[PDB]
Design an enzyme around this catalytic site. Structure first.
Site, PDB file in Angstrom:
ATOM      1  N   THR A 128      23.750   0.083 -28.740  1.00  0.00           N
ATOM      2  CA  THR A 128      22.541   0.799 -28.362  1.00  0.00           C
ATOM      3  C   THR A 128      22.865   2.249 -28.038  1.00  0.00           C
ATOM      4  O   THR A 128      23.918   2.542 -27.461  1.00  0.00           O
ATOM      5  CB  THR A 128      21.892   0.148 -27.140  1.00  0.00           C
ATOM      6  OG1 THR A 128      22.881  -0.012 -26.117  1.00  0.00           O
ATOM      7  CG2 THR A 128      21.314  -1.221 -27.480  1.00  0.00           C
ATOM      8  N   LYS A 129      21.944   3.145 -28.409  1.00  0.00           N
ATOM      9  CA  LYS A 129      21.960   4.538 -27.977  1.00  0.00           C
ATOM     10  C   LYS A 129      21.115   4.671 -26.720  1.00  0.00           C
ATOM     11  O   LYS A 129      20.084   4.004 -26.595  1.00  0.00           O
ATOM     12  CB  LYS A 129      21.399   5.454 -29.064  1.00  0.00           C
ATOM     13  CG  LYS A 129      21.625   6.935 -28.807  1.00  0.00           C
ATOM     14  CD  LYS A 129      20.462   7.656 -28.121  1.00  0.00           C
ATOM     15  CE  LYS A 129      20.875   9.048 -27.672  1.00  0.00           C
ATOM     16  NZ  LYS A 129      19.905   9.634 -26.717  1.00  0.00           N
ATOM     17  N   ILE A 130      21.544   5.537 -25.794  1.00  0.00           N
ATOM     18  CA  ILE A 130      20.880   5.726 -24.509  1.00  0.00           C
ATOM     19  C   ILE A 130      20.935   7.206 -24.144  1.00  0.00           C
ATOM     20  O   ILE A 130      21.926   7.888 -24.440  1.00  0.00           O
ATOM     21  CB  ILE A 130      21.532   4.885 -23.382  1.00  0.00           C
ATOM     22  CG1 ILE A 130      21.680   3.391 -23.761  1.00  0.00           C
ATOM     23  CG2 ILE A 130      20.786   5.117 -22.037  1.00  0.00           C
ATOM     24  CD1 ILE A 130      23.030   3.017 -24.419  1.00  0.00           C
ATOM     25  N   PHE A 131      19.857   7.704 -23.541  1.00  0.00           N
ATOM     26  CA  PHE A 131      19.900   8.900 -22.711  1.00  0.00           C
ATOM     27  C   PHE A 131      20.277   8.475 -21.297  1.00  0.00           C
ATOM     28  O   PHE A 131      19.585   7.649 -20.693  1.00  0.00           O
ATOM     29  CB  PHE A 131      18.552   9.614 -22.697  1.00  0.00           C
ATOM     30  CG  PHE A 131      18.284  10.477 -23.903  1.00  0.00           C
ATOM     31  CD1 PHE A 131      18.983  11.654 -24.115  1.00  0.00           C
ATOM     32  CD2 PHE A 131      17.299  10.125 -24.803  1.00  0.00           C
ATOM     33  CE1 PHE A 131      18.711  12.447 -25.218  1.00  0.00           C
ATOM     34  CE2 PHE A 131      17.028  10.914 -25.900  1.00  0.00           C
ATOM     35  CZ  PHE A 131      17.734  12.073 -26.107  1.00  0.00           C
ATOM     36  N   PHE A 135      26.394   5.921 -25.866  1.00  0.00           N
ATOM     37  CA  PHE A 135      26.277   4.754 -26.714  1.00  0.00           C
ATOM     38  C   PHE A 135      27.071   3.647 -26.041  1.00  0.00           C
ATOM     39  O   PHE A 135      28.128   3.913 -25.457  1.00  0.00           O
ATOM     40  CB  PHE A 135      26.805   5.059 -28.113  1.00  0.00           C
ATOM     41  CG  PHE A 135      25.957   6.039 -28.901  1.00  0.00           C
ATOM     42  CD1 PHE A 135      25.998   7.400 -28.636  1.00  0.00           C
ATOM     43  CD2 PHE A 135      25.140   5.598 -29.922  1.00  0.00           C
ATOM     44  CE1 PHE A 135      25.246   8.290 -29.363  1.00  0.00           C
ATOM     45  CE2 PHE A 135      24.386   6.490 -30.655  1.00  0.00           C
ATOM     46  CZ  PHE A 135      24.446   7.838 -30.375  1.00  0.00           C
TER      47      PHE A 135
END
Lengths: 136, 244, 123, 52, 470, 177, 386, 36
Positions: free
Chosen positions: F37-40, F75
RNA sequence: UGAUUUAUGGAUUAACGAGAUUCCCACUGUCCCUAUCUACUAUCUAGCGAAACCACAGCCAAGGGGGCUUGGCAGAAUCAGCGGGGAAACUGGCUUGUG
RNA sequence: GCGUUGGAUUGUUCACCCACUAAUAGGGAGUGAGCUGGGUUACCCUACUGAUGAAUGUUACCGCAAUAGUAAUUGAACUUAGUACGAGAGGAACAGUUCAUUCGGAUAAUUGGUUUUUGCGGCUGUCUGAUCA
């Protein structure tokens, strides 16, 4: 202003720019508000859109519930914490700076309010005055 | 006798006005058409009084009274208090009162005999209201909905509350307050009826967006036409289930 | 129009001079001027600070209690405007202040009696 | 939305001028002139208090 | 997006569209180049021009498409009647044509930009830009007819009525010139002409009405002839699909009358042709202009015809006419009661309203829990005085009117005084002093004050006679 | 979106996208699968990391280069999965995890203040009693005057001197008790 | 290029070229024309600003949100000793403009105006107007020749006045002249009215009254030479542009090699004339009345002149005008007071106005006490007072 | 009104001699064509 | 040119660095939006007293493929601030919306 | 004629999203003097802004006005009206009245800011034998 927003607005002091965190007084579960925008402004070169009491503002939530955080919504100012002027002669202000949420037609979202609210705000808007426990 | 009328363009009427069996109070916004709208129904029978509060217009939620007594908060100017006593007869008792919290119409729903009160009120005010009105005063919240005076309308005829109240609260409050009541809506689902509309035993006022079922049910529960003592409710039970 | 007493000064705040403050606990505090307000913000004690009546009345300078003082409380019972009633009240106030002046004067005179004998032994 | 200088507004304001809001003025200036006239008479009798 | 769509703002013809867009970029954008400038400036200028016109084009085509209602799966009613009425094939190929158009102009825009990034010189770029614009112009010239066809459907769809098919409705179908115009006029404010000719009403006409504190719509049909059910004009076809689609009661406007002088065999065979589409429709026949004939004098042959109609299982007849209000009202009451029956048999099979309706039906009773009666106070005076008459030569002055008549709405000052009680009205108009040297007077004002200051005078007497003030 | 936007409201969008990623992951994640997963990096980052350690076996944050290095592009891989047939519904709804600690309007009594190392930082206001026998015991000393009758009503307006005074009075009341 | 955000300049060009005026007397450029059926009437006055103070009022404003409520607002106050008439000029019409052709004076003249027309006074023999008074001091008729000249000719007239400055606190002791025009017809009536108004005073209540909108023209409040940032609203430069920072940094390039006139290069501010219009009167007090400051509500016996006096100006023993707003001018400056040049329209100009209370508190600091009496009560007794 | 800019009628010599040289080019092209 | 390899589970890297960065809390005239106060100079005067630079000197627009032509104005003499100037852009009427 | 916003953003942002606003149109002459990249004697006079000045017998006062300049703008509410119009749903209007936005000119009553009045107090160390000062 939009539908529901009653009356006219007097010139009151413009204390709060965008991006001043303030507290929230309703029983939604939202703690604080962060303004991103003011409605009904003018524009002047490198002015910041300035907020005041009695204003309906486009603003996000930072702390509160996960459902309502981090999305922009309409909000009314109720407490300034910077000195404004009454026309019956006095200057005044609150301890801390505060605003509530509501829909674009001005109708209240919560079911309660904490703390004192602005007189002009409650006169201009019905529904904060409907949900107001405390004014001045 | 239910009537649709709009303060200046707001369907919210009990923000801006108060009504007893014995007198009525109106704000001073603009032109004398709201006053005239009420005077068309009432005539010179009782006083419909233009007023102000702190140079503010919000009387239907800042003020609270009955035919026996009437209150105002601290912040009223004494000129206006003089103006009130000159306006009204000497039958009704009058008082300015000192509080933490001032929102009288928001905090009290009351009729000529009995009142509901917000729980965090101070006891000296709890004493004074019972002294002045000579009425029985009760400290509860309605379905956990607070500022009960704003989220409820009341008269000696019947009762009204916002629609989300459960039946057990409706029952216990009806037994408490000694009139029939209904969890209802006004003015296109406006849950706040204390601010949305105004009642006495013989007149009811709404804003223009109120529908035919809504005016019908409140006309039934408050029995406005001499005589509609639950008869129009017994007729219009069926529209309740068909519509809602 | 309403004159007000200062919360810190116990001085008259006329209209349009001085500043109101209002708390989260819903309490208005008028302040006579910057000095009054800034001391409140500084969280001082006027009961300690000398030149105000809050100190003086409690520290046994000028008389704190009298029947002349119990005329001018709030009236939350606003009766009906008799013009002859006001015609009496005005003269009554005019005389109430005179006797108040004399009561203050006698308070001060019995406060400051006894200087001369102690000056006599000072020499 | 309109200017100051608009033809509509100015003919409207002109009927409004030759309607009410000159009437008060015609009253005002006559009252004023009466006071001005009688003040000269006060000054005349003040002169005649020196004449005597 | 629904409900008598209006946001299909306008379509030009193709030539005038080209005139729009070309003169728009010509006016807005710069229009001047000298050769002596540099070539990045020149290249980028023509790039600016082509991308400007491209965005203007495709935005207009987006205003076409997003405006247009996208008939597939919008409501089967609106979708299918549009398919009957507005040449579904011609519609879809037109929208396909502009869709390939917008893809084309985007393609040629991107490719000419890819060409122009290394455009070397001025004649080259000028020829190029003119060339590209002519190509997009040429495809816009290819498409004259379908856009004008869509202009007409824009106009017509704006003239379309507004229907929610889900809601409580009353379809009214009858023969031509039976008195439906009189009927809808008598129930509802809609003045459709009553004139005795064949195709008088050509499309679907609405009148809204109310009864028993409810809202109803009434949807009258243009009227039907035999055209026997195999192929048919779009008017009767949309009437048929209205019957097919809308879930509410259906009403037959029978003429047991001397008027509508088509024969009863024509009427009944028309009815027989529309028998199979009366499956689930809640059909309700009503016979019209019956007060003229009093049809119990009817002969047995025309009687056994109406029994030939009444052979069907579900049917109900009423009698009404178009000269008095009571029968038209009572058959309307019965028709919306049929609709109440239909909505009831639709609604009581889900068993979901039972969980949330008891909160609204619940009228509370106190049981009155006391010894003392609390009576609603109503004065004598409210009973004494008359209700106000709006229209009267002599009536209460209603000072709204006074403010208007002096006066104005926002110019006139009410005397707030001279409305209330004093001992004397003469000093009602007097001024309160409200102020003293200090010591504002409203905290002083009370009765008994002469007695009190006299008491204080006894006190100062008591001190001065002893000589306290030395 | 294109990287570098605003980091609050796009934090809402990525957070809700990731929550849908949980709802499909718990549907169809095989044991020792991969949930990447990509995250801010947001205020919710502690919550999601805490409950990922509460829910999963191997949870590694990559901290990748070759992004803008001005946004909080973080990530994360979650490998290892229990495949629960019994599921914990308290750890999917973000309501119980949002506890809000205080440090350490109100009107309270004073005998509790006499009675009750951090038990001092909460004395905000007090109320008055005159008739109780312990008050009658406490009557016969300096109390009930010289601003004490008011300093029961409010405490904000004191400052540090009368804080020390009131604390000395609490020592007095404590040795009385 | 086209500078990518187009914005308004800092300043008004209409009040340029910005320069110090010629004299402290504000000169009037035009008056309200005429009603030549109405009687004679003055069109302007002289006054002397002294200070500002505060009012509350009950505003009768239909439509408002302050209909019939208390509202506070700030006033200023001009001294106005009545004003004495000394002479007339006659003015004609040409196609070059108006032209003075004759002035006539009024045969007995004060040392005040003689102090004006001399500049070094005490070193004079004071021989100003002697032979003119001797040209009168006979059967005369020279005066009459001129007056009838003006009656025949001379479409327009104006009248010469001066103030009674000696009746003030003020240390100037030199009388201010003026020309004032009139609004009657009947030129012979104008001139004979003046002939009888010679050596006669005129108060202001003979001209002005309540609920009126007037115009003030005055001269303003020097600051001396000012840089651009303080003078106009120009921005300040960030830091370390060499050769100075509170300035215009880049005006351009070697194209344009020529400077513009609309970019607020440095110079004076202040001591310019200005005109500010539709200022509403609230009150006209008369110095003979004790406690002109006693409003209709209050009924405390007190005069407006506040404790500590006015600031840089004394206390009033004359009339006064009380207008709202802020008149241009500074403390103890002159003003020239015109009326409104037209028939105004605003319903704001109409209110039968009810002021509630005048402040008289002291302006040498944060005034709290209106009168020494109230102070003496509130304080009580002292060491010195007995 | 705002009376807008004109073009002149002034000579502006470069255009004169450009006209003459252009003219000779035109007549040359005409002679090159005129055999056909 | 120099942290760690003959089943040690080393080779995966704790610590190490006047090295760099993302989010969050704090902070503040960077900013909204500027305002004010200080010492010195700037300024003026008594005295002392240069240099750089300098064909001439000077008011502007169009034109001529700073001065000439045509026009606009210009009133002695001058002070203080000023920073805009001080012996890389139409071949040929170029360019414009329509292959 | 007037006006045309505030933010986030680069191993190939390319054309952007976010919102507000009545709108958030386009180009020239511009910083070849301040700033960003993977980057190849402004002291002389000039004009400008401010400021004086002999001259016309002198000096002073009062004015005209050739001319040159020019600035106001924008939106919302109250009725009007829930009217017209509209099947409904929806729903304006110029006349009258009042507020605000923007811009400008002035102003200092009051509120806030500011202190070399170094005004009145307070404080550290030292020095004047200690105190006072």
């Amino acid at each position: 202003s939009g539908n529901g927003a009653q009356g006219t607005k007097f010139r009151i002091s413009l204390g709060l720019p965008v991006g001043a965190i303030m507290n929230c007084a309703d029983n939604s579960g939202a703690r604080n508000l962060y303004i991103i925008a003011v409605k009904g402004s003018g524009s002047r070169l490198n002015r910041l859109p300035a907020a005041s009491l009695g204003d309906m503002v486009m603003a996000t939530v930072k702390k509160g519930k996960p459902e309502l955080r981090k999305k922009v919504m309409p909000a009314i100012v109720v407490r300034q914490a910077k000195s404004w002027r009454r026309r019956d002669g006095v200057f005044l202000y609150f301890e801390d700076n505060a605003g509530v949420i509501a829909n674009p037609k001005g109708e209240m979202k919560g079911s309660a309010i904490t703390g004192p609210v602005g007189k002009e705000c409650a006169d201009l808007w019905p529904r904060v005055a409907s949900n107001s426990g405390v004014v001045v | 006798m239910a009537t649709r009328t709009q303060f200046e363009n707001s369907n919210e009427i009990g923000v801006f006005s108060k009504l007893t069996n014995t007198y009525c109070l109106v704000a001073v916004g603009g032109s004398e058409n709201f006053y005239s709208a009420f005077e068309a129904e009432l005539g010179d029978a009782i006083p419909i009084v233009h007023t102000t509060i702190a140079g503010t217009r919000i009387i239907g939620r800042m003020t609270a009274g009955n035919r026996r007594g009437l209150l105002v908060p601290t912040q009223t100017t004494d000129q206006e208090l003089q103006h009130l006593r000159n306006s009204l007869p000497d039958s009704v008792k009058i008082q300015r009162v000192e509080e933490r919290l001032s929102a009288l119409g928001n905090v009290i729903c009351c009729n000529d005999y009995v009142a509901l009160v917000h729980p965090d009120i101070d006891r000296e005010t709890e004493e004074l209201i019972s002294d002045v009105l000579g009425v029985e005063v009760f400290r509860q919240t309605i379905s956990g909905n607070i500022l009960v005076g704003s989220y409820c309308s009341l008269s000696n005829q019947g009762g009204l509350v916002h629609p989300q109240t459960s039946v057990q609260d409706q029952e216990e409050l009806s037994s408490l307050l000694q009139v029939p009541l209904v969890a209802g809506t006004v003015n296109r689902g406006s849950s706040v009826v204390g601010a949305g509309m105004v009642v006495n035993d013989y007149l009811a006022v709404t804003g223009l967006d109120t529908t035919a079922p809504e005016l019908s049910v409140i006309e039934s529960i408050f029995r406005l036409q001499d005589a509609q003592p639950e008869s129009i409710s017994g007729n219009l039970r069926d529209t309740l289930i068909e519509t809602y | 129009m309403r004159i007000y007493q200062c919360h810190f000064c116990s001085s008259p705040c006329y209209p349009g001079h001085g500043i109101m403050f209002v708390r989260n606990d819903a309490k208005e505090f008028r302040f006579c001027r910057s000095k009054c307000h800034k001391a409140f913000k500084q969280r001082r004690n006027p009961r300690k600070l000398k030149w105000t009546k809050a100190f003086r009345k409690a520290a046994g300078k000028e008389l704190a209690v009298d029947s002349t003082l119990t005329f001018a409380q709030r009236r939350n019972v606003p009766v009906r405007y008799n013009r002859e009633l006001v015609a009496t009240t005005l003269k009554a106030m005019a005389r109430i202040e005179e006797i108040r002046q004399k009561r203050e004067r006698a308070f001060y005179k019995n406060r400051m009696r006894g200087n001369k004998e102690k000056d006599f032994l000072r020499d | 939305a309109k200017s100051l200088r608009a033809s509509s507004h100015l003919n409207a304001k002109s009927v409004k001028r030759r309607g009410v809001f000159q009437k008060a003025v015609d009253a005002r200036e006559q009252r004023i002139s009466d006071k001005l006239k009688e003040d000269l008479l006060k000054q005349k009798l003040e002169d005649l208090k020196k004449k005597e | 997006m629904q409900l008598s769509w209006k946001d299909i703002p306008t379509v030009a013809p193709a030539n005038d569209l080209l005139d729009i867009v070309l003169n728009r970029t010509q006016r807005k954008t710069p229009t001047v180049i000298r050769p002596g400038f540099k070539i990045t400036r020149i290249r980028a200028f023509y790039m600016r021009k082509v991308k400007y016109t491209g965005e203007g084009f495709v935005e207009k085509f987006e205003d076409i498409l997003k405006g247009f209602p996208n008939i597939n799966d919008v409501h089967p009613f609106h979708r299918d009647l549009m398919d009957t009425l507005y040449e579904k094939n011609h519609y879809k190929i037109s929208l396909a044509a502009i869709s390939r158009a917008k893809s084309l102009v985007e393609q040629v825009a991107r490719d000419y930009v890819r060409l122009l990034k290394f455009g070397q010189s001025l004649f080259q770029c000028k020829q190029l830009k003119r060339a590209a614009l002519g190509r997009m112009a040429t495809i816009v010239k290819k498409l004259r007819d379908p856009l004008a066809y869509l202009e007409q459907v824009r106009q017509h769809i704006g003239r379309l009525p507004s229907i929610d098919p889900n809601t409580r409705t009353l379809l009214i179908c009858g023969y031509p010139n039976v008195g439906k115009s009189s009927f809808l006029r008598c129930i509802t404010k809609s003045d459709v002409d009553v004139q005795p000719y064949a195709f008088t009403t050509k499309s679907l006409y609405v009148g809204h009405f109310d009864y028993k504190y409810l809202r109803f719509q009434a949807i009258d049909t243009p009227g039907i002839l035999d055209r026997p059910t195999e192929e048919m004009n779009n008017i009767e076809m949309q009437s048929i699909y209205a019957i097919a689609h809308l879930r509410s009661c259906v009403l037959y406007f029978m003429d047991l009358s001397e008027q509508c002088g088509f024969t009863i065999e024509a009427q009944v065979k028309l009815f027989h042709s529309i028998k199979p589409l009366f499956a689930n429709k809640s059909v309700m026949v009503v016979i019209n202009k019956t007060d003229i004939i009093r049809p119990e004098d009817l002969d047995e042959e025309r009687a056994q015809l109406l029994e030939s109609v009444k052979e069907v299982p579900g049917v109900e007849i009423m009698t009404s006419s178009c000269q008095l209000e009571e029968n038209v009202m009572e058959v309307r009451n019965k028709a919306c009661e049929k609709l109440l029956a239909s909505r009831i048999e639709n609604k009581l099979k889900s068993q979901s309203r039972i969980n949330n309706v008891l909160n609204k039906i619940h009228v509370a009773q106190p049981q009155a829990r006391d010894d003392v009666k609390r009576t609603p106070f109503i004065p004598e005076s409210v009973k004494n005085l008359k209700k106000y008459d709006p229209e009267d030569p002599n009536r209460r002055k209603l000072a709204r009117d006074i403010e208007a008549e002096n006066g104005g709405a926002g110019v006139f000052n009410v005397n707030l005084k001279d409305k209330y009680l004093l001992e004397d009205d003469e000093w009602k108009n007097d001024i309160m002093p409200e102020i003293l040297d200090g010591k504002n007077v409203y905290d002083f004002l009370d009765p008994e004050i002469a007695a009190k200051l006299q008491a204080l005078e006894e006190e100062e007497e008591k001190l001065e006679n002893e000589g306290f003030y030395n | 979106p294109n990287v570098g936007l605003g980091w609050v409201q796009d934090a809402f969008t990525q957070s809700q996208l990731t929550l849908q990623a949980l709802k499909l992951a718990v549907e169809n994640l095989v044991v020792n699968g991969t949930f990447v997963t990509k995250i801010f990096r947001s205020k919710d980052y502690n919550k999601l990391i805490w409950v990922f350690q509460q829910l999963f076996e191997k949870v590694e944050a990559t901290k990748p280069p070759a992004s803008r290095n001005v946004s909080a592009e973080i990530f994360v891989v979650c490998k290892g999965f229990k495949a629960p047939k019994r599921l914990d519904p308290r750890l999917l709804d973000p309501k119980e995890v949002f506890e809000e600690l205080p440090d350490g309007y109100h009107e309270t009594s004073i005998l509790d203040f006499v009675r009750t190392i951090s038990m001092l930082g909460e004395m905000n206001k007090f109320t008055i009693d005159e008739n109780d026998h312990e008050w009658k015991i406490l009557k016969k000393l300096k109390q009930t005057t010289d601003e004490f009758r008011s300093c029961i009503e409010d405490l904000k307006v004191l400052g540090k001197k009368d804080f020390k005074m009131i604390l000395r009075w609490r020592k007095i009341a404590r040795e009385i008790l | 290029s086209h500078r990518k955000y187009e914005a308004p300049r800092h300043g008004h060009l209409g009040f340029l070229p910005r320069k110090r005026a010629a004299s402290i007397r504000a000169r009037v450029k035009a008056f309200p024309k005429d009603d030549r059926s109405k009687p004679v009437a003055l069109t302007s006055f002289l006054g002397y600003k002294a200070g500002m103070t505060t009012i509350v009022r009950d505003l009768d404003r239909p439509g408002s949100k302050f209909h019939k409520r208390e509202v506070v607002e700030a006033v200023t106050v001009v001294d106005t000793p009545p004003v004495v008439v000394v002479g007339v000029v006659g003015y004609v019409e040409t196609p070059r403009g108006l032209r003075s052709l004759t002035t006539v004076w009024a045969e007995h003249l004060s040392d005040e105006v003689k102090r004006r027309f001399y500049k070094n006074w005490y070193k004079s023999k004071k021989k100003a107007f002697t032979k003119y008074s001797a040209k009168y001091a006979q059967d005369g008729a020279g005066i009459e020749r001129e007056l009838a000249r003006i009656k025949k000719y001379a479409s327009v007239v104006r009248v010469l006045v001066h103030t009674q400055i000696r009746k003030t606190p003020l240390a100037q002791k030199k009388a201010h002249l003026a020309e004032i025009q009139l609004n009657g017809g009947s030129i012979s009536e104008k001139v004979d009215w003046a002939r009888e108004h010679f050596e006669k005073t005129v108060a202001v209540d003979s001209v002005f009254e309540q609920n009126e909108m007037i115009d003030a023209i005055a001269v303003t409040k020097g600051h001396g030479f000012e840089g651009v940032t303080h003078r106009w609203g120009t921005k300040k430069l960030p830091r370390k542009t060499h050769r100075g920072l509170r300035k215009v940094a880049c005006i351009g390039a070697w194209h344009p090699a020529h400077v513009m006139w609309s970019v607020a290069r440095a110079g004076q501010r202040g001591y310019h004339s200005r005109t500010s219009i539709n200022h509403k009167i609230y009150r006209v007090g008369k110095g003979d009345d004790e406690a002109n400051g006693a409003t209709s509500f209050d009924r405390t016996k007190k005069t407006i002149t506040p404790m500590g006096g006015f600031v840089h100006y004394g206390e009033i023993k004359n009339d006064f005008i009380m207008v709202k707003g802020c008149i241009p001018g500074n403390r103890k400056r002159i003003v020239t007071l015109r009326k409104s040049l037209y028939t105004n329209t605003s319903r704001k100009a109409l209110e039968e106005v009810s002021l509630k209370w005048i402040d008289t508190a002291s302006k040498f600091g944060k005034g709290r006490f209106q009168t020494p009496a109230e102070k003496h009560a509130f304080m009580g007794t002292l060491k010195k007072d007995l | 009104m705002r009376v807008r800019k004109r073009q002149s009628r002034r000579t502006s010599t470069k255009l004169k001699e450009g006209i003459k040289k252009k003219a000779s080019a035109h007549r040359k092209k005409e002679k090159k064509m005129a055999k056909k």
